[PDB]
Design a protein around this ligand. Sequence first.
Ligand SMILES: CC(=O)N[C@H]1[C@H](O[C@H]2[C@@H](O)[C@@H](CO)O[C@@H](O[C@H]3[C@H](O)[C@@H](O)[C@H](O)O[C@@H]3CO)[C@@H]2O)O[C@H](CO)[C@@H](O[C@@H]2O[C@@H](C)[C@@H](O)[C@@H](O)[C@@H]2O)[C@@H]1O[C@@H]1O[C@H](CO)[C@H](O)[C@H](O)[C@H]1O[C@@H]1O[C@@H](C)[C@@H](O)[C@@H](O)[C@@H]1O
Lengths: 113, 417
Amino acid sequence: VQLQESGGGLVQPGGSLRLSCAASGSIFSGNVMGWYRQAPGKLREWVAAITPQGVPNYADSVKGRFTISRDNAKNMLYLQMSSLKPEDTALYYCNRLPNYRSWGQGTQVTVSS
Amino acid sequence: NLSKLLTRYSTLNTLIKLSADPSAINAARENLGASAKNLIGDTKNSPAYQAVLLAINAAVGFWNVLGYATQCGGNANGQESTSSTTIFNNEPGYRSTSITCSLNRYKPGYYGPMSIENFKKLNEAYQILQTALNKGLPALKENNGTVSVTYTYTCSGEGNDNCLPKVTGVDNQNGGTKTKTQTGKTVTTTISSKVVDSQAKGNTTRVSYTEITNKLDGVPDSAQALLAQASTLINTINTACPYFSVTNKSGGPQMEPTRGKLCGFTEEISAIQKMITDAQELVNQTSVINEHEQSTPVGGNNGKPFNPFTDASFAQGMLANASAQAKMLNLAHQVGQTINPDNLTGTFKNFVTGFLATCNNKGSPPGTVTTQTFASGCAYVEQTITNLNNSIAHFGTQEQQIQQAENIADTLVNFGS
Ligand SMILES: CC(=O)N[C@H]1[C@H](O[C@H]2[C@@H](O)[C@@H](CO)O[C@@H](O[C@H]3[C@H](O)[C@@H](O)[C@H](O)O[C@@H]3CO)[C@@H]2O)O[C@H](CO)[C@@H](O[C@@H]2O[C@@H](C)[C@@H](O)[C@@H](O)[C@@H]2O)[C@@H]1O[C@@H]1O[C@H](CO)[C@H](O)[C@H](O)[C@H]1O[C@@H]1O[C@@H](C)[C@@H](O)[C@@H](O)[C@@H]1O
């Protein structure tokens, strides 16, 4: 019952970033986990997900460019972002699916020249 | 002050803007329609379907594991018998597709043999579940599907009264039949009775016996109906609480305790009951979603722009629909977490990883009873947990849309007070 994202920052278009989430065991263990983002003037959008066994799936807007993964020994969730565009600018958040009702603080990603 | 408030929570600014826009409201209503079809109209991809299937498979699996070890016997009024052998076909017995109830002298009941009356309730429910699993469960919204089920049992031995016209309903032990019906849908049961003499060509076995056939027509195969059978299965086992005695192969998985009473699996039975209870609650949300369709576009009226304080009487319905869908998704999840071995511990984990989520048959289709079904689940429990997770993962976009729509509606229900 706790979620903590990090790894964001300001990068140039084309660039790359790795985000992390430290989740608690009760959230993480045996649950599907995923990443979300909330861009300016929009509501939170689902981005990627991954099952306990490690099978990932992605929203169309990021497919081919982002990779989600999980470390089951450390309750860590990761999102490798490549080929960043300005449109990927957002606060990124991780959670289990279906969602625990209290979100973490998020990590800001800004992509801009 | 609201500007102060929206500078801190800019998602709320966005929400209020969407709530005042018929075109975003209608987009959210459309989403609810498409997420509803995913939940109650699809099979593979519905988390609700996968969870209902998991609750039923767990109950069925529980019996496939322990049925062979379970004592049963006696005569028709729950009383002890002297020399009664009553055999139920298509059941997961020891090296056999039948279970044999032949414990004499002991009184049926708690920490003793299951009465034949209780085995009949259990068996009927098991046959209906297995036939339905074999055909495939329909999507949750389907309430008028039916299945046909046929099962047999035999009585032999001096004094065995479990196959007697008086108990069976039939007119004549040899050749007779009886038709009876029951209930919101009519199920018709046809019972027929036959005697096979010891000295009769084709009688491998030593002995004279009576064979009873039950043919049920129009048995409903909806989720609610099947969850009721699963509950009947698990609750009959728990209430009757019979003695069991297991055979442990050397090498493979070990069952502790090796002897005792079936209620004694308290963690396992609680979990299954909870799964079934949660799946019943989940399926009930279907009538809420059906009652509050969201397909009618909304907007202002008589020329004027939309007014979120007066034109939004559809919001209560939109909020109830959205919340029911979220509740289905959450209960589906909860069903999976009750049985998923990643979070179980001790005795209970061992029961699931070693026995329940295992098949010893030579993927044979669901609902099949072989001579090697015993001491293993054979109800696709591992595959069903995996598919439930896969479908939750594939429900990411829809879940966020359900939340958006719940929030829009909630904003309008508040504005409307
Ligand atoms: C106990 C029983 O089943 N009695 C049957 C009887 O079976 C005996 C006969 O087949 C004789 C024939 O010589 O053999 C006996 O088995 C032998 C075996 O052949 C040997 O090889 C072996 O070494 O030893 C054993 C014995 O130790 C059988 O026990 O058969 C008759 C004829 O089929 C049957 O009665 C007929 O059916 C009944 C229902 C009724 O319609 C009669 O009018 C028919 O004649 C006996 O059934 C019992 O008959 C009683 C009336 O006399 C009562 O009707 C009683 O309820 C019947 O038993 C019930 O029905 C049986 C078919 C069976 O399912 C029982 O478990 C049940 O209680």
